[PDB]
C-alpha cells in the first residue's frame, strides 16, 4: 500500500510546519527542546543525503528539500533568532549519549554493510530516540508553552498511519523490515510518553 | 520508466520443479523490493515470496515454505523464483512486482505481464 505512507509523511510534514509556524508568529520557542530539533534535523540530513545526487521527481526533490528547510529553519529560530526565549537551562540532555550509541548500533545491526545502507540505518535509529531530549525537558518543568494540541495530533497521526502501513504490507505483500519496525515501535512508544506527559503535566 | 518481464512458465507434472525469472529494465533506484504474486483461476491474487535489493532477508508464504526459494542477480537486473516439488494447486499466472523502498517514491510501482504456470496432477 502507498496511501498510508503518503498521508503519514504528509502528517509528519504538517507537524514540522505547525511547530515552525507557531515559533515564528509567537516570537518565542519556550518549552521547545532545541536538542531534539537538532537531532531531527540530523535525521533528515542523513536520510535525504541523496538530494544533492540522484534526481527522481519534482515531488521527490521538493519533499526532501521541504523537510530539510523546515527543520533547519526551526533550528535557526531557536538558537539564533529567538534565542532569548530558549530555555537552555532546562534542555540539558547530553545528546552525545544518543548519537554515539546510535552510530555504533548502525554499524553493528543492519541489513547490509554498505555506506548507503549504514547511513539509512543511522537515520532510522536516530529518529526513534530523537524526542528524548524533549521528554526530559517536559518531565523536568511540566510546561511546553509552544507545544500545541494540533502539533501533537499530527505527530500522532504520523505514527498511526505508519503502524497501519507496517500491518498492511506484511499481510497483503509479505514485506516486513524488522529494523524499521523495531525502531518504529520504539519511536511510537516514546511519542506516546510525550503525549502522556503533555496531558498530565502541562494540561495540569 | 521501468519494465519488468517474467519468463520460465509453462506446463509441468506434479512433483516437478520450475524456475521463473523477472528481468528488470529502465532506471534503477538504490533500495527496492521484489515480490512474486500468483492468481489461480477465480481466486484473488496472493503474494508468494519476497526479497530486497541487498541482504539475506527472504520471505515465503505459508503454502510455499520449504518448496520455494527466491534469489537475486543485480548484474543482469533479474530476480529468480526456484519452484521445487510442485503441486497442482500451484497452477496460476505468476506476477513479479518491484517497489521503490526510498522515501517519497510512492508512485514507483511496477508489475510484469505475467507468465502461465500449469501443474498437471
Ligand atoms: C535504538 C533503537 C532500537 C534499535 C534496536 C535494533 C532492533 C533490531 C533490528 C535488527 C535486528 C534483526 C535482524 C536483521 C539484521 C541482522 C542482524 C544480525 O544478524 O545480528 C544482529 C542482532 O540481531 C542484534 O540484536
Numbering used by the authors:
A (entry chain A): 1 to 204
B (entry chain C): 2 to 122
Paper quotes:
The selective capture and retrieval of ER luminal proteins is controlled by the KDEL receptor (KDELR), which recognizes a specific ER-retrieval signal sequence (ERS) Lys-Asp-Glu-Leu (KDEL) at the C terminus of cargo proteins. Crystal structures of the chicken KDELR revealed a seven transmembrane (TM) spanning integral membrane protein with structural homology to the PQ-loop superfamily of membrane transporters. In the mildly acidic environment of the Golgi, KDEL-containing ER luminal proteins bind the receptor with high affinity, which elicits a signal for the integration of receptor-cargo complexes into COPI vesicles. In contrast, the neutral pH of the ER results in cargo release and the subsequent relocation of the empty receptor back to the Golgi, resetting the retrieval cycle.
In vitro binding and cellular retrieval assays highlighted an essential role for a conserved histidine (His12) in peptide binding. Due to the protonatable nature of this residue within the physiological range of the secretory pathway, it was proposed that this side chain may form the pH sensor for the KDEL retrieval system. We reasoned that the loss of the W1 water molecule at pH 7.0 may also be linked to the protonation state of His12, which would mechanistically link the protonation of the receptor to stabilization of the interaction between Glu127 and Tyr158 and the generation of a stable hydrogen bond network observed at pH 6.0. To test this hypothesis, we determined the structure of the His12Ala variant of the KDELR at pH 6.0 bound to Syb37. The structure was determined at 2.3 Å resolution and under identical conditions to the previously reported wild-type (WT)-Syb37 complex. However, in the His12Ala variant, the electron density maps clearly show the loss of both water molecules in the binding site, indicating that His12 is both necessary for the stabilization of the SHB and for the stabilization of the water-mediated hydrogen bond network coordinating the carboxy-terminus of the signal peptide. Combined with our previous KDELR structures, our results confirm that His12 indeed functions as the pH sensor in this system.
